[PDB]
Amino acid sequence: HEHCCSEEDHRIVQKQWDILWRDTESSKIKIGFGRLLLTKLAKDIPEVNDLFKRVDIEHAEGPKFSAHALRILNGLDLAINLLDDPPALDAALDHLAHQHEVREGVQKAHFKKFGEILATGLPQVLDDYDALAWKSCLKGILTKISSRL
Amino acid sequence: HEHCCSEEDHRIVQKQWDILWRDTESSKIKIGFGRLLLTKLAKDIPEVNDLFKRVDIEHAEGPKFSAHALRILNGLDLAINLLDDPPALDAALDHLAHQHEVREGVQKAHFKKFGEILATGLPQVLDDYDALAWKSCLKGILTKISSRL
Amino acid sequence: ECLVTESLKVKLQWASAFGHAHERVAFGLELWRDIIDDHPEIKAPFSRVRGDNIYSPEFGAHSQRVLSGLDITISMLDTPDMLAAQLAHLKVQHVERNLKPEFFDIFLKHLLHVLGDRLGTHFDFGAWHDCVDQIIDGIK
Amino acid sequence: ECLVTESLKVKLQWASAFGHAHERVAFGLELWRDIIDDHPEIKAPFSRVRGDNIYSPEFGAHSQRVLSGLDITISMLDTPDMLAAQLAHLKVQHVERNLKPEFFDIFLKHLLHVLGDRLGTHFDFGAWHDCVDQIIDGIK
Amino acid sequence: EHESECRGDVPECIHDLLFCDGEKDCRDGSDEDPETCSLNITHVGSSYTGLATWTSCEDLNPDHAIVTITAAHRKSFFPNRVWLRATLSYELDEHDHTVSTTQLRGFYNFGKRELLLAPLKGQSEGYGVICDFNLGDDDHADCKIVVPSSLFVCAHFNAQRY
Amino acid sequence: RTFQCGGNEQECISDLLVCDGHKDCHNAHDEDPDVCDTSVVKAGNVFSGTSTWHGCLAREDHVTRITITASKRRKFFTARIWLRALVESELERHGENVTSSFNAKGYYNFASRRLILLPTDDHDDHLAVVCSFNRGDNERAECHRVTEATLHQCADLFVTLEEHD
Amino acid sequence: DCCSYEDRREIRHIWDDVWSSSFTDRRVAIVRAVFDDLFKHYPTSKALFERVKIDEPESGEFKSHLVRVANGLKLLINLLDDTLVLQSHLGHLADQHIQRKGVTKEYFRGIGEAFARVLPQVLSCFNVDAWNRCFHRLVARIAKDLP
Amino acid sequence: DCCSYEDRREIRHIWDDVWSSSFTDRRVAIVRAVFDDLFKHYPTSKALFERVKIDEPESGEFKSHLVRVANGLKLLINLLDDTLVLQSHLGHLADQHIQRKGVTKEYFRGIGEAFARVLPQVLSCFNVDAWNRCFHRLVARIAKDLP
Amino acid sequence: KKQCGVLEGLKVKSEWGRAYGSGHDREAFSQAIWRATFAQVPESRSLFKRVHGDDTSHPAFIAHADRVLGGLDIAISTLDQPATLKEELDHLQVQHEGRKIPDNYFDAFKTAILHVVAAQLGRCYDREAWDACIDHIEDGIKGHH
Amino acid sequence: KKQCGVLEGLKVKSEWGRAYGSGHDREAFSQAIWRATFAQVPESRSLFKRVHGDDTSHPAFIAHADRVLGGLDIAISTLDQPATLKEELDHLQVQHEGRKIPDNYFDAFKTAILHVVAAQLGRCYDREAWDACIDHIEDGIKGHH
Amino acid sequence: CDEHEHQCGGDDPQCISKLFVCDGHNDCRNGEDEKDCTLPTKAGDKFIGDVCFDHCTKRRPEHMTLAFESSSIAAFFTPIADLHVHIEIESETDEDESEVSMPADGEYSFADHRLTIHPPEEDGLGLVGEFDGYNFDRFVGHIVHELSEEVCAEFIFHRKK
Numbered sequence A, B: 001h002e003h004c005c006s007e008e009d010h011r012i013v014q015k016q017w018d019i020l021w022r023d024t025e026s027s028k029i030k031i032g033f034g035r036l037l038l039t040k041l042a043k044d045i046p047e048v049n050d051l052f053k054r055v056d057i058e059h060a061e062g063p064k065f066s067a068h069a070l071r072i073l074n075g076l077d078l079a080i081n082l083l084d085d086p087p088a089l090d091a092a093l094d095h096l097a098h099q100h101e102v103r104e105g106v107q108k109a110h111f112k113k114f115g116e117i118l119a120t121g122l123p124q125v126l127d128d129y130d131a132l133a134w135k136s137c138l139k140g141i142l143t144k145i146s147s148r149l
Numbered sequence C, D: 001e002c003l004v005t006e007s008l009k010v011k012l013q014w015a016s017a018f019g020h021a022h023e024r025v026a027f028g029l030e031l032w033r034d035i036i037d038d039h040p041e042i043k044a045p046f047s048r049v050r051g052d053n054i055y056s057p058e059f060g061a062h063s064q065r066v067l068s069g070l071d072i073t074i075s076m077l078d079t080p081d082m083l084a085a086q087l088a089h090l091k092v093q094h095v096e097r098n099l100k101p102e103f104f105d106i107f108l109k110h111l112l113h114v115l116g117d118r119l120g121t122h123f124d125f126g127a128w129h130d131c132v133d134q135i136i137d138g139i140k
Numbered sequence E: 001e002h003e004s005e006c007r008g009d010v011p012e013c014i015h016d017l018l019f020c021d022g023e024k025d026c027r028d029g030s031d032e033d034p035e036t037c038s039l040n041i042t043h044v045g046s047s048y049t050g051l052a053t054w055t056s057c058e059d060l061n062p063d064h065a066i067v068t069i070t071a072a073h074r075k076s077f078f079p080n081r082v083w084l085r086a087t088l089s090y091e092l093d094e095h096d097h098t099v100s101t102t103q104l105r106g107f108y109n110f111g112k113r114e115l116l117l118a119p120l121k122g123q124s125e126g127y128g129v130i131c132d133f134n135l136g137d138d139d140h141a142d143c144k145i146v147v148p149s150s151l152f153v154c155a156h157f158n159a160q161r162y
Numbered sequence F: 001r002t003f004q005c006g007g008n009e010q011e012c013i014s015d016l017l018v019c020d021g022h023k024d025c026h027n028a029h030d031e032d033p034d035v036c037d038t039s040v041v042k043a044g045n046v047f048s049g050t051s052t053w054h055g056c057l058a059r060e061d062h063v064t065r066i067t068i069t070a071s072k073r074r075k076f077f078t079a080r081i082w083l084r085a086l087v088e089s090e091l092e093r094h095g096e097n098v099t100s101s102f103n104a105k106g107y108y109n110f111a112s113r114r115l116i117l118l119p120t121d122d123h124d125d126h127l128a129v130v131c132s133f134n135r136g137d138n139e140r141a142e143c144h145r146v147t148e149a150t151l152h153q154c155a156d157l158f159v160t161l162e163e164h165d
Numbered sequence G, H: 001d002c003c004s005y006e007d008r009r010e011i012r013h014i015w016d017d018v019w020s021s022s023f024t025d026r027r028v029a030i031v032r033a034v035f036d037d038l039f040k041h042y043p044t045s046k047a048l049f050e051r052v053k054i055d056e057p058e059s060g061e062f063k064s065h066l067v068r069v070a071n072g073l074k075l076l077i078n079l080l081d082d083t084l085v086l087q088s089h090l091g092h093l094a095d096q097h098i099q100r101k102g103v104t105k106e107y108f109r110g111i112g113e114a115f116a117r118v119l120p121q122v123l124s125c126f127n128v129d130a131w132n133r134c135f136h137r138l139v140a141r142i143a144k145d146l147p
Numbered sequence I, J: 001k002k003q004c005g006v007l008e009g010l011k012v013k014s015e016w017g018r019a020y021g022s023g024h025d026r027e028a029f030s031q032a033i034w035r036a037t038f039a040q041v042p043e044s045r046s047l048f049k050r051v052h053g054d055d056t057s058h059p060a061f062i063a064h065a066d067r068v069l070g071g072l073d074i075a076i077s078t079l080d081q082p083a084t085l086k087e088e089l090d091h092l093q094v095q096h097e098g099r100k101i102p103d104n105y106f107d108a109f110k111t112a113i114l115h116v117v118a119a120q121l122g123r124c125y126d127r128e129a130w131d132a133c134i135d136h137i138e139d140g141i142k143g144h145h
Numbered sequence K: 001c002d003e004h005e006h007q008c009g010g011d012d013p014q015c016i017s018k019l020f021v022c023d024g025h026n027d028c029r030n031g032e033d034e035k036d037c038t039l040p041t042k043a044g045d046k047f048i049g050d051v052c053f054d055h056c057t058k059r060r061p062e063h064m065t066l067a068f069e070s071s072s073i074a075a076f077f078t079p080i081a082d083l084h085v086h087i088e089i090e091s092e093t094d095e096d097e098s099e100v101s102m103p104a105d106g107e108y109s110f111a112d113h114r115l116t117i118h119p120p121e122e123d124g125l126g127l128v129g130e131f132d133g134y135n136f137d138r139f140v141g142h143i144v145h146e147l148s149e150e151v152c153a154e155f156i157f158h159r160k161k
């Protein structure tokens, strides 16, 4: 239970997640990627479309949503970049829990799915992907984030 | 006007010009090369044949000329090898100017041509050639040599 | 079909593979050599750019110009309006010559073979095939 | 004919060449690529394991499974009773498909070509040819 | 590997298994002079500490590591090695001060001047530790917390004695 | 870009804390007075030495004279000493002794004991100078003339603080 | 119950000690010794291998089998650095056992115990826990649909 | 007015800062911003690009153009280490502009000024002189017969 | 002295990429910035009482910091997409309105950022440019000028 | 405490591989072992009077030592082939019967081996296992238990 | 400094050609190239070498004495002092017991405090000892193949005082 997402584990994740932000046009990427990630979520579970209604998910390319795409995708960044400081990461995530707690409609099963999606997506943009390491870490993150619903 | 044939520039020229003298039979090379260089000059401008008459240019393979081939080609060496000591190089070249001044018949247009020839020849014997660097340096040299005519 | 990720992947890998300065000429050369040895029929249209001697500067130049265009197209996979236009523009510069549409199918075969070496096992064949293909058909 | 030394030689060289972990996938990949480019007819039976995209994980898996078996056979060259059995076992897993016996003659051609690169001039071609051959016929 | 140089003026190399065994093995006998066979390091109660900064086996942010010797005997007929037992302790939570304490077994190599300890086998399978005292004296060492199994470096800490 | 702490409690610190006023290292070596002696680059200090050229100029081995003009230290950000300085180069050109000098602005970083001096936009194209005081003291430093862009090294320059007597 | 990267490294080494020689002999005796422990505990399973002639221990038809098992394990471990491929072959390895009528989810948990009892005897410095952890992750996926 | 090797190195770097992303967006805005400065100073030239539809800035038929120009420049710079090839493509680049009726020797000297005014704004640490030097050598050869 | 236009944006957006960095550099970059901010206006510590503003090194705050720069990232990272940026800024604007944050603080926080960034980038860094853009971004969060 | 069975054999056989080593390590490994043996029972030096047992560093003895380990190698290296081992042991048995070698010495020599091997292998080494096998090998040379 | 240049040290370094060290002209600003020109191995002196790594000598001897017979410096080329040396050796086997005193020429370069002793026997083996710079009572002596410059024997030589 304590061997999940270990130093080496995340040291890896971190390294691999960086292959992404090598070029200055991170925005275009983060957006496109996050956009797709959320879309593919609403695809498999529609009751989501209503949750992201507030951010005009109806218009994927709409700034309203594009901004959102960043915020989330960028939050995942924060999570990953704090992997090497458990107490901080903890706090950082707990905070994310609360930001999701007051958003009724969002249930655990959503994250479980988003996780599966994220796990099938990453390896499509990263040539070097270590499924084992990632799954280990993503789990810890996604869980702590939804631990309030 | 002071960025022509800079330290890096000639450091390069020098390095590339050395690819040539790796084998002990420098004579055979210097000669053949210098021989060709002068020949190809008389080819494009015949009034030259009369200048090199004194050294039996008529007999390209004739020792009389072969020796000459060296002297000249070897002078170019001196020039190149003193590129990293402007005052010396200067003096060394000025001297070459005088050795050409008292040789009537030799006009500037000759050097301009010899330069173009030299620039088309070098890259034929050197696999690694940096046209820009060389042209920069060869210019400075050829000019200072003919600055008396 | 080249969607959003399948592009970024290529856009990214192209970076590492292609490279910068000389590293490129090397790439181009290696590429065309493998292509011409497989189908010497191509040395024909490349007559204007000394295709007989691929190591020559004349051809070297060409080689580069080519890869460059490829760079452009690849850098436009995300924006359709520009790609569709760019591709159409390239088709014209080609159609004007006896070009067996299979030549491109060949070019592609090798471009992948080469990137394969350069990138190694990480090379996302899928993404490239689906993506570079679309670029060829727009010129074929 | 693969005697006692001619085996140990291969058993040993296989070690250095094949390698460990990733080093292997790389080998497998390089191998199959060269094979498929030479005879694209093979992409056919490899349809189950995405043979169109050799860089895919599906095929990658396969690639490895193969080499592994090859490892086994090679590690049995010294013990005949096990080899004869193992080989027979492999023949079955293959016969069930339209497999031109020449395919193996091809596979061998490349396996040697590749080991050639990996091992260099030390590569004991003789030993391998005499020895790996004996493994193929038992499956051909 | 498996050899260390004499401390004499002549940098001769002799096998580790030969230092301090009672028989002049080095050209000059440097492998037997006291300045070499000093037990100063393996003295009972000896303790070395530094700041462990982990690079491979635990969340933990730089914390204090302490490898201290708990008992050590030298079999009369086999002097080459000073078999011993020690304890490796490193802070867990810098705030509530919890701290891990694994018991170790091992020896000290006169040749390499290296302390090699591993867990006693059967106690939560913790870590081991390698300390080189090649730092010049008997009080400074370059310790590295390893994983017994592969001696793979879990973390590193430059230690001092006291 | 990181600061190594005391040889006993070894640990890395970002030079944005190099010497900021808050104990960041376990041994606090990142606030140890001797690490942050402002005197290294006290205004008025003068460093001279020979500049041997091997990269971007056909200059004869001449001397350079870096002299600190001024030095501010933001009270809300101590990790850096901002400073202005005067770089002179007594070199021989066409004829006799000339002097090619220029005004510079830059900073001093305790963590690396690096002193970076860039030209005050002097559009005459001067090579930024860079010194490291890695020599065990605050008197001597190892410098190089470089292009502000690539930081490519055009020349080697070993300076020494001039005595005031 | 997570196979850490460190643990993988641990195993990627532990293995290099059992799978040293390129000669069957060793690996055989070990894999065998493993099964003997499986059969002494879940005798039932024994019958499953009549196809390979377990009644003839030194048969060769069976020895070869043992090797294939060994090598199949080797292949797994030697894939721990290429996750994605491992994840696939790991599935393929399941299917090869699902079509083998009579193979329970239990027998696997049983062979797992086997190694954990054998390995610690064939080599020293065996991180039983680390092994156990990553072995379970491997087994779980193999016999997910096996029971 | 000589493009030194050092200068080449300077540029081979300066460029790596503008031509960072493999996404059009950036390079576009820059090359555009460059032309906008060419047109604000030599408005005559504007007409020359009706073929690519400059009247439709966001057209795409035009954006693609900008890119081609950008990339054409990129290709040049990324050739500064292979002199001989550069010297040839540099010619080929001329011919592509000589056959473009209406392109003066002036317009080039004008776009040169353009960059020298734009670049220093899109990135810091721009050796305007070094750029200027090697850019002129490039331009000169391109429009030697253009006037 | 300059407005956060097209180019000046690209410049800051790029330079920010280098200064921001990742991993520990980040956890510090933010650290440094906040220390510089609070050092300027100790009064402001009272606003982050909820997220341990008393101890800049407390995980809670570390998170907060790293979380703040996060937004700033999105902001800067989109200075070339007015449409989107607009949104992010507006979003932030909300998370802040309500808190009595004087233009006094924002000013200090900008200064902080600038000084740290300058310390991090060494030589290649345009001050005016950043000033202009950090400003434009802050304006979008206050609503003022 | 354990018998030299199948596995315990493989273990010793493997560990021995590492401890034995080659070249100089060997010339010493043996050296160390003998010194440890003679130190225990100086009485035994008298038996190797023929091969300069007086000076453990004399070539004659060096040979002898390196020669002895040799047999021990064959022994251990075949603990997994009872058939063959049996033979080697028997062969040794002969070269030894006749010499008044008390079970007392063999005991010391085992101890020696064990202590040195442990010193050489550092951490990965099962004592019981070696004890058990070195024993089984010695028994095969004495004839006793 | 470059391959064939001498470093003058000090708080302000300067590289000059090794052909200038101890030549009579003040080539270095500081003067190093001329203030330390004392010849260590001068006529009469004897040096005893203790072996510690011998993979080539014909005798693989325990020691090796190095006697300096004569030494003269050319008045016009101070940078190199020519030496005449006898390399003595005390061998002793089972089949015999030999003694040797092979004579060889050699020079000492103040340029880098390195005395090169030309091969004594026609087996292509010569000695090359480089001095500390400040010691002069102990130098590491490498026995090499002149042609190749391969090291195959190291002896620590001490001045027999």
Ligand code: HEM
Residues within 6 Å of the ligand: A048, A051, A052, A054, A055, A071, A072, A073, A075, A076, A079, A096, A099, A100, A103, A106, A107, A110, A111, A114, A141, A142, A145
């Ligand atoms: C690990 C991935 C996730 C991260 C890191 C994450 C991050 C975020 C962040 C930063 C916000 C914006 C809070 C703010 O600034 O006001 C947010 C809001 C939200 N998240 Fe997540 N989220 C993740 C997964 C999910 C999942 C699985 C769901 C799906 C039901 C979800 C549903 C929402 C909703 C509905 C909002 C409200 C957005 C709005 O209207 O403002 N999130 N999330």
Ligand code: HEM
Residues within 6 Å of the ligand: B048, B051, B052, B054, B055, B071, B072, B073, B075, B076, B079, B096, B099, B100, B103, B106, B107, B110, B111, B114, B141, B142, B145
């Ligand atoms: C950079 C290339 C050149 C170099 C370095 C060079 C060098 C020399 C040298 C060393 C001499 C011999 C002086 C002596 O020892 O008495 C010489 C003589 C001469 N050079 Fe050049 N030269 C060069 C180019 C030219 C050109 C372009 C011309 C063509 C008109 C030219 C015409 C002559 C003539 C006519 C002589 C007289 C040779 C004789 O009869 O002795 N040189 N040059």
Ligand code: HEM
Residues within 6 Å of the ligand: C042, C045, C046, C048, C049, C062, C065, C066, C067, C069, C070, C073, C090, C093, C094, C097, C099, C103, C104, C107, C135, C136, C139
């Ligand atoms: C997908 C890859 C390809 C791209 C992106 C591409 C791009 C280019 C470009 C930009 C030019 C230079 C036009 C100019 O500036 O004058 C060019 C010229 C040409 N291409 Fe392609 N090309 C590709 C594939 C092919 C293939 C398959 C053939 C091979 C038969 C081919 C034959 C030609 C020829 C003959 C020329 C003109 C040579 C000349 O300038 O004399 N191209 N190509």
Ligand code: HEM
Residues within 6 Å of the ligand: D042, D045, D046, D048, D049, D062, D065, D066, D067, D069, D070, D073, D090, D093, D094, D097, D099, D103, D104, D107, D135, D136, D139
């Ligand atoms: C001497 C080298 C060869 C060896 C040792 C070998 C070994 C293997 C092994 C062990 C498998 C995996 C069976 C399984 O676990 O399901 C396999 C499958 C197969 N082999 Fe081979 N093979 C060799 C050569 C070939 C050749 C020449 C061909 C090429 C036509 C071939 C075609 C196949 C096919 C089509 C499969 C089944 C793919 C699937 O699982 O869907 N093999 N081979």
Ligand code: HEM
Residues within 6 Å of the ligand: G045, G048, G049, G051, G052, G068, G069, G072, G073, G096, G097, G100, G103, G104, G107, G108, G109, G111
């Ligand atoms: C440690 C995990 C295991 C691995 C890695 C493994 C590996 C293998 C392999 C490679 C094959 C041979 C496939 C072929 O070449 O056709 C196989 C077959 C089989 N396995 Fe496993 N196996 C494992 C555990 C088990 C367990 C626990 C049982 C249950 C008793 C089992 C029962 C079988 C049977 C009966 C076959 C069929 C053999 C035949 O008749 O040819 N396996 N296994």
Ligand code: HEM
Residues within 6 Å of the ligand: H045, H048, H049, H051, H052, H068, H069, H072, H073, H096, H097, H100, H103, H104, H107, H108, H109, H111
């Ligand atoms: C900095 C140097 C310049 C570069 C590197 C450059 C590059 C290019 C390139 C690559 C093309 C496209 C060729 C094709 O794909 O068919 C082109 C076309 C052209 N260039 Fe330039 N150019 C430069 C300067 C100029 C200048 C100063 C003018 C004059 C205003 C100019 C006018 C044109 C025009 C009008 C075309 C035709 C575009 C069309 O209608 O397709 N160029 N240039």
Ligand code: HEM
Residues within 6 Å of the ligand: I044, I047, I048, I050, I051, I067, I068, I070, I071, I072, I075, I092, I095, I096, I099, I101, I105, I106, I107, I109, I137, I138, I141
């Ligand atoms: C351009 C600069 C600024 C940006 C981009 C910014 C961004 C942020 C962000 C993203 C949050 C976290 C919101 C959440 O996830 O709940 C935040 C929170 C906050 N900001 Fe700002 N902020 C800026 C300037 C300021 C200033 C000047 C102050 C006052 C000194 C300030 C005071 C706060 C406070 C008190 C919080 C909430 C703390 C909490 O969560 O308890 N911010 N800011």
Ligand code: HEM
Residues within 6 Å of the ligand: J044, J047, J048, J050, J051, J067, J068, J069, J070, J071, J072, J075, J092, J095, J096, J099, J101, J105, J106, J107, J109, J137, J138, J141
């Ligand atoms: C398992 C342990 C032992 C092994 C494997 C062993 C092996 C050997 C071997 C191979 C030889 C050399 C035979 C030859 O080539 O002529 C030898 C010789 C001998 N062994 Fe042992 N031996 C062992 C224990 C002992 C012990 C305990 C003693 C008594 C202290 C002993 C006394 C002798 C003597 C005196 C010789 C003959 C010396 C000679 O050649 O003059 N051995 N032993």
Ligand SMILES: [Ca+2]
Residues within 6 Å of the ligand: E018, E019, E020, E021, E022, E023, E024, E025, E026, E031, E032
């Ligand atoms: Ca000793």
Ligand SMILES: [Ca+2]
Residues within 6 Å of the ligand: A007, A084, E054, E055, E058, E059, E060, E061
């Ligand atoms: Ca850590």
Ligand SMILES: [Ca+2]
Residues within 6 Å of the ligand: F017, F018, F019, F020, F021, F022, F023, F024, F025, F030, F031
């Ligand atoms: Ca600090």
Ligand SMILES: [Ca+2]
Residues within 6 Å of the ligand: K020, K021, K022, K023, K024, K025, K026, K027, K028, K033, K034
């Ligand atoms: Ca001198």
Ligand SMILES: [Zn+2]
Residues within 6 Å of the ligand: F087, F088, F089, F100, F101, F102, F126, F127
């Ligand atoms: Zn200056």
